[PDB]
Design a protein around this nucleic acid. Structure first.
Length: 335
DNA sequence: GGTTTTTGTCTGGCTTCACACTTGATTTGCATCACTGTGTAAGACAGGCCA
């Protein structure tokens, strides 16, 4: 795992904490710019090209049948196999939380244009949230989305302008979501007692593993690991969760896929005052510590760090500038 | 209804200021001076995407 500094072009200001990267056919794209989209790029979606350790953001266009979704911070995203991306939730430039679901696909590639379609949701729609997970599980030749966790504003009855921005963890209900028709079913599980946000999520076959996270009520970053199995018979699905020992304690960690069936997670925040400098390896479930990479002193002495998974087993991370550039960016590679 | 208060009424002879008038040398009131540094926005100017 080698660390590499990156320089950025004129629109470095667009990058902010909560951004996302999506990988389409080896090409990387960036979503969730700071501010509302400007005339220079009306969609807010960018080709994310790092050539010779230099990052260029190039405007991407949407198809005629697309939504123009707002930039979103901390939405739950996953990849769905045409190959497409699922966006649910997030914060808007106006600080509203979106409950909507957007679906991204490559509509046309000339020398890329995207199709962005919103899927309406009925039934037990999850309250709009950020900092939550969504993945796709496969059971008996059927595909279903699993959504869990996060935080949101207070409900309209208790919300008050003096604490207008105050947040609480969402109730820890598992949500099954059929993307074709847009339906949602909520499952209360006895093993999931507390709320959780900014956790890590790993989906394999009919299972989703939940790692780390932060629970607001206790203000604990629990060192538990949860396995979630989903069976899809012809009738109503069945979901069963089990607690597993050996769970790491980390919030806002980043996750990437090395080779096949091996995942590595690079640090997040282990305590409010402390940062998780170590890295973990998950084999599909067993967790082993890895040799910590050659962090520079700037990374070591920063209080805040943020990043995203690029797709190619490589992480794109960023650190805040000195008091006297706004951000300094690095790329950490694996495999 | 009785039983309690507020607020007047009628005089004058009192006490305590304000005004009266002047002159001209002080004292106050008031608007102005000359002057730059700093914020602001009107307007040069650098710039990179796509044809």
């Amino acid at each position: 795992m080698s660390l590499q500094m990156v320089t950025v072009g004129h629109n470095i200001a667009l990058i902010q904490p909560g951004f996302s990267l999506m990988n389409f056919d080896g090409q990387v794209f960036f979503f969730g710019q700071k501010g509302w989209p400007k005339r220079s790029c009306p969609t807010g979606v960018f080709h994310f090209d790092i050539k010779q350790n230099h990052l260029k953001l190039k405007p991407a266009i949407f198809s005629k049948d697309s939504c123009y979704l707002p930039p979103l911070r901390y939405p739950a995203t996953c990849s769905y196999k045409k190959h497409q991306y699922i966006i649910h939730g997030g914060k808007t430039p106006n600080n509203e939380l979106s409950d909507k679901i957007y679906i991204m696909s490559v509509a046309c590639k000339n020398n890329v244009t995207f199709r962005c379609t919103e899927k309406d949701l009925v039934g037990d729609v999850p309250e709009p949230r950020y900092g939550h997970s969504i993945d796709v599980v496969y059971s008996r030749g059927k595909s279903m989305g699993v959504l869990f966790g996060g935080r949101s504003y207070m409900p309209s009855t208790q919300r008050t302008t003096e604490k207008w921005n105050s947040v609480a963890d969402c109730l820890p209900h598992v949500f099954l979501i059929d993307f074709e028709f847009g339906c949602a079913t909520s499952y209360i599980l006895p093993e999931l007692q507390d709320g959780l946000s900014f956790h890590v999520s790993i989906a394999r076959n009919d299972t989703v593993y939940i790692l780390g996270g932060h629970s607001l009520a206790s203000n604990i970053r629990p060192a538990n690991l949860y396995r979630i199995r989903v069976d899809l018979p012809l009738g109503t699905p069945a979901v069963n969760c089990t607690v597993l020992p050996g769970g790491i304690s980390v919030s806002s960690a980043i996750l990437t896929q090395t080779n096949n069936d091996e995942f590595v997670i690079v640090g997040g925040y282990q305590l409010e005052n402390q940062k998780r400098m170590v890295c973990s390896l998950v084999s599909l479930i067993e967790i082993s510590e890895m040799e910590t990479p050659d962090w520079t002193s700037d990374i070591k002495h920063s209080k805040i760090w943020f990043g995203s998974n690029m797709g190619n087993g490589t992480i794109f991370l960023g650190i805040p500038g000195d008091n006297k550039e706004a951000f300094y960016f690095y790329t950490l590679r694996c495999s």
